[model samples]
Target: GSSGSSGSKVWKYFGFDTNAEGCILQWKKIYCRICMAQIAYSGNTSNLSYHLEKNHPEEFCEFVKSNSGPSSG
Candidate 1:
């Protein structure tokens, strides 16, 4: 299940709870700002992070190295 909460780290970092008009954003709970891909957050970050690694390894690695934190989709 998707928490969709502001406190959720994955949501805060990636997904948007509301649209530009402030309405609830439906589908693709997790949004990838890098590739502009909308992903569903199904209780874990493995899928999302894997998408990043598999699709955009170079930039993803760069971001992780610079941020000193983990990149989870």
Candidate 2:
């Protein structure tokens, strides 16, 4: 099931908690499918991006390119 949206585009790197039936249970605290760790904070994407850069620098690099980011835009 879809939690609709977690407000930020960073959601592509994270997901909501699901129950035994694979139904979304929580949408507040997001879990990273990469490290499978729960991350706190939701209002801003900086933490999500921070986690990516800190724990998954390589993926973050790919993210930067794919997201078409950088003030150069």
Candidate 3:
């Protein structure tokens, strides 16, 4: 109950949501920091990714920007 990674753990397997800033706090306490969404599936990377892919593409761009030089402006 107290002190757990169950919530954020779901995101771990998904390859997203690091929760470095206390984004999730075990179990039902899950969410997407980029879209301000309070998710509590306790699991489901596809859904989260799907959402970000369509809704938060701007934020998702951060990933590509990490290695893909962003410039030409």
Candidate 4:
């Protein structure tokens, strides 16, 4: 169940009333700035970016910035 796109807003994953209540020690999930692919936090950011570029080219089509981005969806 996706909660739709949360946009470029940064949020506290373990904040009060959040779904994953005990996620206090978790880092924010890295989302692709191009296609919005939710990158797992198991590795470095560079790796995650590579994965995004490799798998979801359509989303990153001619994208320039690596900050907050829009998804094709």
Candidate 5:
């Protein structure tokens, strides 16, 4: 649930699809606003997700599927 804004928290953390508005969320490893390597996993979850998509799409997708799905005991 986004607030209709591009880089808002709700849109960033929540699994909301964005129209690639030029790095609304500053995530680690996915280049900064100026399109530079800012790869660092010490950032927030949203940023981590961004890095996941940018650097490792397949790995990230697998993670998303597994992590989002219900966990088994």
Candidate 6:
């Protein structure tokens, strides 16, 4: 496990701890520590953020709020 470069806003907002490949690997291995959900990365955060907002609203909302901004999800 490694904290790769912060590539996207969704990655940052969702607090995705990345691997050594730095957000660019086969499937990219996007893992969420809070809800324990492992999502495959494909250079897109739209679907990933959608899942976060829908399945884990609490986490999403809290994170978004702390960031002091609004998100489409």
| Candidate achieving the largest lDDT | 2
TM-score of each: 0.49, 0.60, 0.39, 0.32, 0.31, 0.47
lDDT of 4 by residue, 1-73 (tens): 1378655222222122224666633555555444444555654335543563567564334433556567774
| Predicted candidate 2 versus true structure: per-residue lDDT over 1-73, tens digit per residue | 3576544566688766478664555546677888978888666777888899989988787766654455853
26-60 per-residue lDDT for model 6 (tens digits): 34466666677776666566667667788888756
lDDT of each: 0.61, 0.73, 0.51, 0.44, 0.47, 0.62
Clashes of each: 0, 0, 1, 0, 1, 0
lDDT of 5 at 69: 56
Clashing pairs in 5: 29-39
**Per-residue lDDT of 25-71 in model 1, one digit per residue for the tens?**
76546678766777777767767656767788774565444446655
Per-residue error for 24 in candidate 5, Å, reads 29
Model 6 stretches astray by more than 4 angstroms: 1-8, 13-27, 62-73
Displacement of the residue 10 alpha carbon in candidate 3, Å: 9.4
Report the C-alpha lDDT of model 3 over 1-73, residue by residue, as the tens digit. 3486554532532333445566544435556665566655534454655555677676445433445667783
- For candidate 1, give the lDDT of residue 3: 61
lDDT of 2 at 27: 41
For candidate 1, give the lDDT: 0.61
**Candidates by TM-score, descending order:** 2, 1, 6, 3, 4, 5
Model 5: runs farther than 4 Å from truth?
1-38, 41-43, 66-73
Better TM-score candidate (3, 6): 6
For candidate 6, give the lDDT of residue 4: 72
Which residue pairs in candidate 6 have backbone atoms (N, alpha carbon, C) closer than 3 angstroms, thus clashing? Answer: none
